[PDB]
Amino acid sequence: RTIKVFTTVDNINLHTQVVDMSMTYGQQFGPTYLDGADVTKIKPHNSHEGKTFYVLPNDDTLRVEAFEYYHTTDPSFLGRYMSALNHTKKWKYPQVNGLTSIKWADNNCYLATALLTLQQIELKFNPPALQDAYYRARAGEAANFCALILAYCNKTVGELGDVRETMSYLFQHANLDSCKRVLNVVCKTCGQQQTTLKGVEAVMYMGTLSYEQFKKGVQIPCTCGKQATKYLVQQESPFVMMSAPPAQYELKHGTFTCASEYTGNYQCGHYKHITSKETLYCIDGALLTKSSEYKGPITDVFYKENSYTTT
Ligand SMILES: *[C@H](CC(=O)OC)C(=O)NNC(=O)CCc1ccccc1C(=O)N[C@H](C)c1cccc2ccccc12
Ligand SMILES: [Zn+2]
Ligand SMILES: [Zn+2]
Ligand SMILES: [Zn+2]
């Protein structure tokens, strides 16, 4: 005796199966997951009739379908993803100032910061798995998106995480082709060395929190040997993310889009989100806090942009 279930790798192309109800899912298909739960080892239950199961791909049809949804051939991915989903599906995603945050759980403050940031910057993702899961997170259903961010970043539920680190990972999976940053460097010896940057390196700088400061200039070690200073000529990008190791910093309403607060030490600290709406909101999972100024330990500041030229 049998029942009728659907299997997929992407959740777009379903593939109806007839399952022997006395063998396990593992023997009939392969490693198999329902709603993120591993079900490799259980026998088809009667309520499982008419439900979608994620499976690894055997067929090259499914191997191509998985690539075109996830842009990864990596065999471990779909499992690492389903593993996360099983947890993130249990997380609570409260609206907090019409933003989808995550109630703190299974160590997720950095994810909640990254997620809140990702709803305030104009980001087009390349893996359809991600672009779809995002759109859904925007609308409050954010389990899937968090699971993928974890999988795509090689992190797991419980692991601690840098926001700078988690963003660059995602920027790398985002169309930032038309992003261009022209630098200029001047040592009084080397001469006048003008670099161009495209893509992810165009929209991140580790060094100062201050977009203003970068435009004026910041001192560097330089090509020839020693003493030189580098300043932003041009920046065509829809945003830039200025990072630097946690200082104390005054955030003023209207000078910046949003920021990452980091209390504590390297790799054993707690993150909060500062966003500049009518006032400065500070978001800590499900806890909103507003304030006209904000001095605290800032490490990442996102600025909105499209085209800037120097003088
Ligand atoms: C939240 C923890 C929680 O949920 O508790 C309620 C969480 O996951 N926090 N993340 C971390 O603690 C992990 C921090 C981390 C991980 C890897 C690499 C760097 C970092 C990190 O500490 N980043 C911070 C911002 C940092 C970056 C660069 C320099 C520097 C210098 C001094 C302190 C901190 C940093
Ligand atoms: Zn890709
Ligand atoms: Zn030099
Ligand atoms: Zn600790």
Author numbering: 3 to 313
Q: How do the authors describe this structure?
A:
We reasoned that replacing the methyl substituent of GRL0617 with a hydrolytically stable linker connected to an electrophile capable of reacting with Cys111 would yield a potent covalent inhibitor of PLpro. Following the promising results from in vitro assays and mass spectrometry experiments, we determined a crystal structure of wild-type PLpro in complex with 7 at 3.10 Å resolution. The electron density maps show clear densities for PLpro, Zn cations, and 7, confirming the design concept of this compound and revealing key interactions with PLpro. A covalent bond is present between Sγ of Cys111 and the β carbon of the ester of 7. The carbonyl oxygen of the ester accepts hydrogen bonds from the indole side chain of Trp106, like that of the tetrapeptide-based covalent inhibitor VIR25111, and also from the side chain of Asn109. Indeed, the crystal structure revealed that the proximal and distal carbonyl oxygens of the linker interact with the backbone N-H groups of Gly163 and Gly271, and the proximal and distal N-H groups of this moiety participate in hydrogen bonds with the carbonyl backbones of Gly271 and Gly163. As intended, the carbonyl oxygen and N-H group of the amide adjacent to the naphthyl group of 7 are hydrogen bonded with the N-H backbone of Gln269 and the carboxylate side chain of Asp164. In contrast, in the co-crystal structure of PLpro with 7 the side chain of Leu162 is rotated outward away from the BL2 loop to allow the electrophile to access Cys111. However, when 7 is bound the BL2 loop shifts inward and covers the inhibitor to stabilize the bound form. Severe steric clashes are present between the naphthyl ring of 7 and Phe828 and Lys838 of USP4, both of which are conserved in 80% of human USPs.
PLpro is a 35-kDa domain of Nsp3, a 215-kDa multidomain protein that is key to maturation of the viral replicase-transcriptase complex (RTC). In addition to RTC maturation, PLpro enables evasion of the host immune response by cleaving ubiquitin and the ubiquitin-like interferon-stimulated gene 15 (ISG15) protein from host protein conjugates. PLpro consists of thumb, fingers, and palm subdomains common to other ubiquitin-specific proteases, and an N-terminal ubiquitin-like domain involved in substrate recognition. The active site, which is located at the interface of the thumb and palm subdomains, consists of a catalytic triad comprising Cys111, His272, and Asp28612–14.
